[model samples]
Target: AYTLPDPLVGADGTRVHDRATWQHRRRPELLQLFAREVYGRTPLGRPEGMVFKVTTMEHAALGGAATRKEVTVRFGRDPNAPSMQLLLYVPNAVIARAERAPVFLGLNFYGNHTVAQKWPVEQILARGYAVATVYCGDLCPDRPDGLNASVASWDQRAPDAWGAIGVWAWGLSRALDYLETDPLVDASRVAVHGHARLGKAALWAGAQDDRFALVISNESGCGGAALSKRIHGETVARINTVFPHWFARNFRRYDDHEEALPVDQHELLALVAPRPLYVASAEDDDWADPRGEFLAVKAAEPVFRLFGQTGPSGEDVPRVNEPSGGALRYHIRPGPHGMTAQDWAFYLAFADEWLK
Candidate 1:
């Protein structure tokens, strides 16, 4: 059997037995390590002078089942400044609820116009949960030199600056800034989600920003949900070689030395303790290591228990396509490497349990 870096234990061998110690001591230690060695980016709240402009609104969209609203979030005072497009669909019934509706927020791999099938607006709106998303490319291009034009380029610079994943995660938070301002959104109940690479970003964002009431990761293998020491499918070396821009520069030092890294993937899940966390994977996607994802979830249950919450206590991979766990849950769909309708069903049910 393989071992992992204990989340309840700190760098100085301090065991965290109480919530206050974890929050005031261990949590900060874990977060600092992850930021300084892994993501290379930290949560910076809204920048002043940023503006939002509504570009499209249809009250009777989706056959009158929902209202489609498109807003552009600009990063500067000038209209021509860098910006991202946010497409949201609020259920018609939510308007009459007299309160903000819970929303699922994330970054889409493709642009808003092309994410309809993955988003399934009708299904989500039918469940009374709004959907808000921005394309990943809006924050930074998925290329070697993307940092030169991203938010990383805006502020000061450093060798350990954030990569694409960090930029996308930060953009998700900026979108949250707008969500907090919108009357239709229940910002406190917002859930952040992602698949594959974006899945990694979602975890980092949820760990950094607590505004996301729930966190969901689908097929978030490798750096997202899979344990590195396991070295099951996608290794850190492979990721660094192919997508060197996905993590901090310091991450490369552990390229083939994963066992030496101070933290593991499970700690990322632990960082979301007491808050609802969901990790889902595709059965056939070995590159993402389906079981490794589940193992990380199982390993993080103790931290959840510290908050009097629990789930994923099983010692083996959970039943496929069937969701397991409580505050920390997981499911492995019998399909390929993407999110499906079955996954959404489990997602909504989990939301109803904690956010409704």
Candidate 2:
């Protein structure tokens, strides 16, 4: 386990109340405020004039793990044509059958290959579940000012607050567009998932696009599974201040004023209601506010129950690192946040249980 700073409340002096108000009142309200006043609604215009194609496909394996045919599919006019790739690893040959197997799809910071160097490519390929991924840098360049540099030709409007993250979320949805037509893919069971910033994207993409059957967020920070009003770690102000490009221009105004924002992360999670949605956080990684993440799920529980489905595994946030339980089904892992084997184990189990 990693040594962590004692979890600190915001210098902004915001106070979060009970779980219900945290869930029902502040969560959804803050999201809408961020969306409309900040990121602004995205224009539904995809330029077909700009051609897209798959540029590369190859097979390899995670070093020192197993040698498998790892396929990488890139999209766009050329390697430089703003493309994304999918890194897939499924169970075995029998499961890889077209139209049969469900897939776990998500985004990553580095190339998908970097996420798990030991991933079993051959075993997964044989099993048939395809992994679709895009280097997020391809979508938004992962830089504060580089947002427009990636899609200058596509979107003319800039952020009222934080439009770039929304655009990247849009890119994930587009990947779904590509996946739906593939013969080997069962688009209905495609799970949208992510960690950290991409975790926020997974929630947004799953909510905005219903094509994803399962939504999983691992240690997604503020504006993700965490409740905005909690003012724990990575509050909107800090997020916008640090990763200014992640949200819209308008998002900055409410950095410490989460309670006043139009929507919170719960509504974002709730947007995936009736679908299998899982929230995972790290106990010591309070930077992502693990408690807020679970609370956000509890806030959305009513919405899920409205449709007769358990939203997450828990009814309340468990003690830090105690790793308790709930219907919302959250887990506070033992270390600071990032991708890990425990996460994969949970994802595999969650996918099998829910996507089955």
Candidate 3:
């Protein structure tokens, strides 16, 4: 068995046995630790000149099953300032009907043009969800040179400054801010989601912003949901080396020394406690360590219990296709590392119970 720093223990070595202490001391402590040594610190406020420009709105889209909206979320009027294209779809049935609907907000690998086709837009609309997505590249390109073109460009550069992951997460929050002002969306019911690398941003976004009602991570792997200390598939060193701009500079110190990190992946999940969370893995994506992801969910159960909610069972990782039920859910599907329609089904189903 592997070991982890206790989530219930404070940096000062004091025990956290109640909600107030956990919220006031331990929560902030762990949050600070992750920000300082892991993802990097984020601003409590939105961009100074942030603006949302809805460029297109079609009341009938996706064969009339949903209402499609295209928006340009810009940081400032400056042409060079950061911005992202947000594609949103509200079920045609709920458009301007005086009924606020739940929304699934996430980042996609594909561009906004293919989002409607790549994702199950009609299926999601059928489930009565307003689906919204932004291309990850819109926030930042996959390459290191593109780093300056992303939201990371907003802040002054430094070791603790947000990296690719941090900027991506911040981008998600900005999208949520736009959702809050939309009459069609029940901002309080938004679920932030991501797959693969974006999953890391999704988790970090959920951890930092409590406004999100839920978070869904699918095959987030090393820096996302898998226990860093486990040294499983895609260890810290490999990811940082391959994608040097993905995480904070401080994270590089733990390259091969995962044991030295002050917090583990479970704590990252724990940071989303009291809110519904769904973590998924692909059976064949051993680089992500399905078992390690499952254990991370189980490890976070203690924090859920603090809020009077049961967590995932301590039973072994379920067979692929076995979806567990709890406020903290884990889904392991049979395949390689990719988010499929089935994964979305599990997420929507979980939201049906919790977000409804």
Candidate 4:
């Protein structure tokens, strides 16, 4: 049988027995390992002299169900760092009628102009969710030159400086900073959502910042959700070779030597424990290894139990289109890689149950 590093075991061969030990000792140890190895060391805190500019506001957006507000989140006082533009849609009835509404913050692969058309914003607003999104490219491009824009503010010379995923995750946190200041947004119930590469970033952001109440990943295989040692589809070697900028430079060492690594993606899922996490995949998307994603969630169950919460519904993978689980939710939809209305339906329903 193929085996991966045990998430419950410490680096020094010590077995973790309880919540206190895991929280104080094992968790911190694993987080540092991931930082130095996988995602790299993410820079701390908001940028100095950061500014928020609300460039556009529409009262009756999407036929009165939502109100749209677009803002520019600028880092640094001068043109020193690159800026991120946020496109937010708040439920009209909720903003005006309710106390505060939960928000779904995510990074879009394309520009923000494609958000309302591609995503289920109308359904989200109908369910009392305010969705905020930013074009991921604005944070960091996917190419080798991706670091040029945001690396000025971050330590470019450091070996563990933020990568593209880290930069995008940092961008999400900046958006959260803006959300905290909005009167209509209930910052406590904010959920982070992303797909594919951005799905990986969403997981990283939720793990780094505890402010996110829920974390959602869609077909985020390999570095996103699937276990690395399984080595079924995308492997550490393959991803690092093709998209070298997605992770830290140190991760390349574990390319062909998966067993040498101290951590796996299951530990990544465990980092979001005590908070709700949902990982979804498609049955036909072999590149993502839906079964591996399920196994990763199941492996993290022990960590969730430590917090007195159940994880996945059981050890077995559920049928397609059948969503199941406890605090750690999962569903393998019957289709391909991309997100669909059906996917949003499951997520919205899950959010309504947990966030509402």
Best by TM-score: 1
- By lDDT, who's the top model here? 1
- For residues 164-220, could you state the per-residue lDDT of candidate 1 as single tens digits? 998999999988988888888889989999988999999999998888899999888
Error of 2 at 313 (Å): 6.4
lDDT string for model 2 (237-334, tens) is 88888887777677777877766665567767766766778888986788998878888877767666655566445466665434332324677778
- Candidate 3 residues 1-356, lDDT tens each? 25798999888798879988888788888888899898878854587787888999998787887878888888887866667889999997876577888999988887877864377777888988999998888887888766787666655467776788888898899999999988888999999999889899999999999999999999998988999888888899999899988888889999899978888999999999889999999989999888888888888888888988776665678877868858999979988888899898888889999987
Could you tell me the C-alpha RMSD of candidate 2 in Å? 7.6
lDDT of 2 at 140: 73
* Model 4: per-residue Cα lDDT at residue 247: 90
In candidate 1 the C-alpha lDDT for residue 200 amounts to: 96
Against the hidden true structure, what lDDT does model 4 obtain?
A: 0.86
Candidate 2 segments exceeding 4 Å error: 1-34, 45-81, 89-92, 95-99, 116-128, 152-162, 312-315, 319-327
* TM-score ranking, high to low: 1, 3, 4, 2
Would you list the C-alpha lDDT of every candidate in the order shown? 0.87, 0.64, 0.86, 0.86
Tens digit of per-residue lDDT, candidate 4, span 332-352: 998789989989999999898
Ranking by lDDT: 1, 4, 3, 2
Query: Comparing 2 and 4 by lDDT, which wins?
Result: 4
TM-score of 1: 0.96
Worst 10 residues of 3 by lDDT: 149-158
Tell how far residue 277 is off in model 2, in angstroms. Answer: 0.5
